[PDB]
């Protein structure tokens, strides 16, 4: 049996960003989200009431990624400056201030994900990946093997492994403990811009610049292919649903599409953005979907 | 319908919006200039005066921010961020490795509607300039409008000001259906 038509309406609009946004991340409590702008702003939005809790000012205006800690105590950012900045929220005072300034990369920071309150996995532009320790800044593990600059990273629910996608048409699974490549999947003709694990933990989906979404499983092959002759532009963000039946994607023709993870058919269009979609996020309880674009407006759908 | 804390949680948001407006009033009044060019161009950023470098210089009561990357490696990805700039400063000192470079930059998908300033850091001089203008003339009819120069000097802060002035003037004229 299929799913059928799925219609989502814009419930909230998080206006307030000066310039275009690349990254946003949902919180653990499914209430607060964080968004990054190119004018040097990290803004924390209360989703329900459309408020603004924090308006942190950045050091370098060129930021390409953002992350929210699982405990909600820290927020991370990075970009062209080769520095990963960590900000503490629950400080003794009333102002958010930097706590760690990681300087170990030579390319450009493209992704950063928190493992625990003291660990973070960073993906940069020099075709390597790394794992840091926040307390004593260092790189205990430095994953190697990629050729092009790496554009996306995603951890697993168990946090045992994390797949990484670079601009070389290959997705590599890594091991957090040993720190070596475990498997490589090559099924793309162009570079990869997004990646996300299946909720089960034994599969993931990759988006590339040839308007194709690919679904790999840890059988070691590609199970499906999401593509249509109408769509030609690239894909920026890919995310799954809570159960895993749906698959949302971002496109450079300003119209996010919804896909079926089993039948591989279009089942709804999340149109409404004035510019290209650059970030997409599904909340932990699966009650909402947040999308950002280059018009500096965030939209929530349900 | 709102508790006592819910009113202060809206007052704080209003103050945040006030600060954001006060910050945007300053953000809108500054011009950002990307600075490209090969290793041998000699890039000037010191005579006007980490994976990126920003130099701030003010000319005739207006101020600009010039960005130039120094520690990067393929510019295909991090060039998309630099599409909200006023003009691109391209410095050239060789040829056919810089020429192709310029051809690829001008014909970029994301760098459309962004004009380029072309520095050259009597019969011989003009041949290279014509070669450079050939690509700018073969595409981008009504959007890019590149501007060549013959620089080395202490007046490099006036040419950028004049070309930015020209770009904004043409944009304003174009917008009012006056051009």
């Amino acid at each position: 049996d299929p799913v059928g038509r799925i219609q989502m309406r814009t419930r909230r609009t998080l206006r307030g960003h000066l310039a275009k946004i690349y990254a946003m991340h949902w919180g653990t409590d499914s209430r607060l989200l964080v968004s990054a702008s190119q004018d040097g702003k990290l803004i924390i939005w209360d989703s329900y009431t459309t408020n603004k809790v924090h308006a942190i000012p950045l050091r370098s205006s060129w930021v390409m990624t953002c992350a929210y800690a699982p405990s909600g105590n820290y927020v991370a950012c990075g970009g062209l400056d080769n520095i990963c900045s960590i900000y503490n929220l629950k400080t003794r005072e009333g102002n958010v201030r930097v706590s760690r300034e990681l300087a170990g990369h030579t390319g450009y920071l493209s992704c950063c994900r928190f493992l625990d309150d003291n660990q973070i996995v960073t993906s940069s532009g020099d075709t390597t990946c790394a794992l840091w320790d926040i307390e004593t800044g260092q790189q205990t593990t430095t994953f190697t093997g990629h050729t092009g600059d790496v554009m996306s990273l995603s951890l697993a629910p168990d946090t045992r492994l994390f797949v990484s996608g670079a601009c070389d048409a290959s997705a590599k699974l890594w091991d957090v403990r040993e720190g070596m490549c475990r498997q490589t999947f090559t099924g793309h003709e162009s570079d990869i811009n997004a990646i996300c694990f299946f909720p089960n933990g034994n599969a993931f989906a990759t988006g590339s610049d040839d308007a194709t979404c690919r679904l790999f499983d840890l059988a070691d092959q590609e199970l499906m292919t999401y593509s249509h002759d109408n769509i030609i532009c690239g894909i920026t963000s890919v995310s799954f649903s809570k159960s895993g039946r749906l698959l949302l994607a971002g496109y450079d023709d300003f119209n996010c599409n919804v896909w079926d993870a089993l039948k591989a058919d279009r089942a709804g269009v999340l149109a409404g953005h004035d510019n290209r979609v650059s970030c997409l996020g599904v909340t932990d309880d699966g009650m909402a979907v947040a999308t950002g674009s280059w018009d500096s407006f965030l939209k929530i759908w349900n | 319908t709102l508790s006592a804390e819910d009113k202060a949680a809206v007052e704080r948001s209003k103050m945040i919006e006030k600060q954001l407006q006060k910050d945007k009033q300053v953000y809108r009044a500054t011009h950002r200039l990307l600075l490209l060019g090969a290793d041998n161009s000699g890039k000037i950023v010191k005579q006007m005066r980490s994976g990126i470098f920003e130099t701030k210089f003010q000319v005739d009561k207006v101020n600009f921010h010039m960005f130039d990357v120094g520690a990067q490696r393929e510019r295909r990805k991090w060039i998309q961020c630099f599409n909200d700039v006023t003009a691109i400063i391209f410095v050239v000192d060789r040829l056919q490795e810089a020429l192709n470079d310029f051809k690829s930059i001008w014909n970029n998908r994301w760098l459309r509607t962004i004009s380029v300033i072309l520095f050259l850091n009597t019969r011989a001089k003009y041949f290279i300039r014509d070669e450079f203008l050939r690509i700018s003339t073969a595409s981008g009819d009504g959007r890019h409008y590149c501007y060549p120069h013959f620089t080395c000097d202490t007046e490099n802060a006036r040419r950028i000001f004049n070309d930015c002035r020209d770009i904004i003037q043409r944009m304003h004229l174009r917008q009012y259906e006056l051009l």
Partner: single-chain antibody, 233 residues
Framework: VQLVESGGGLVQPGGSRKLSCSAS????????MHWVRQAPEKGLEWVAY????????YYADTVKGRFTISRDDPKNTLFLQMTSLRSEDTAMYYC??????????????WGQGTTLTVSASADIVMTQATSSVPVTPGESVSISCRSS???????????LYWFLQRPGQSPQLLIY???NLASGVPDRFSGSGSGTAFTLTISRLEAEDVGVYYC?????????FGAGTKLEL
């Protein structure tokens, strides 16, 4: 974080005074301030409140037209001017800092306070069960409190606060919104309630849990603390 007081003493009846709470070590401009009054023989009371940016000023119904409050953010110093002092103004005053965003903990720090000795409306009334509960060390304590109205709001929050005043220092926050634990307080203390009846539970007692326990409501803004329960060891 340090709050100190300047002012106080003895004045003629119907005179004037200026009391200044000065701060050091935290971001003043992002905080709102409350003024708390405590009689030498009675419980706590609230007299004035200033928001952030001076956009919302609140006064108690008793002193709605006799006290004024103003702050200097660049000077990081707040003050109140009192005129026409009556015979019910002899007390000790504290300045309290509170911040209101999603998940914040208001009334999280209290100053030392200054003493003033003067020479010669529907609101929630909250009653403590017993004014003096003596308990043995290292035993469970089940202090109770009753409210005249359901403190629960339609959004879920209840706005129930607890305060402990040791014999000599200012009151400190223990529980906010009936469930959350303060940063400095250990895990021994716990709180529960159902809208009208509130319970504060202590598992094990040490040589420093002697003091007076005051309750709090924050739903309808005119607020009263209560006499409290003086734990006896």
């Amino acid at each position: 974080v340090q709050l100190v007081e300047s002012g106080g003493g003895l004045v003629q009846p119907g005179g004037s005074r200026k009391l200044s709470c000065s701060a050091s070590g935290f971001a003043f401009s992002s905080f709102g301030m409350h003024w708390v009054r405590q009689a030498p023989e009675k419980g706590l009371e609230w007299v004035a409140y200033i928001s952030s940016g001076s956009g919302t000023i609140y006064y108690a119904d008793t002193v709605k037209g006799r006290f004024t409050i103003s702050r200097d953010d660049p000077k990081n110093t707040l003050f109140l001017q009192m005129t026409s002092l009556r015979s019910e103004d002899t007390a000790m005053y504290y300045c309290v800092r509170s911040i209101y965003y999603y998940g914040s903990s208001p009334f999280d720090f209290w100053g030392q306070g200054t003493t003033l000795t003067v020479s010669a409306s529907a609101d929630i009334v909250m009653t403590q069960a017993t004014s003096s509960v003596p308990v043995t060390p290292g035993e469970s304590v089940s202090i109770s409190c009753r409210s005249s109205k359901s403190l629960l709001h339609s959004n879920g929050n209840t706005y129930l606060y607890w305060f402990l005043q040791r014999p000599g220092q200012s009151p400190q926050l223990l529980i906010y919104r009936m469930s959350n634990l303060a940063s400095g307080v250990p895990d021994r203390f716990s709180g529960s309630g159902s809208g009208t009846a509130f319970t504060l539970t202590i598992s094990r007692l040490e040589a420093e849990d002697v003091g007076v326990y005051y309750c709090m409501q924050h739903l309808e803004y005119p607020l009263t603390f209560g006499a409290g329960t003086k734990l006896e060891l």
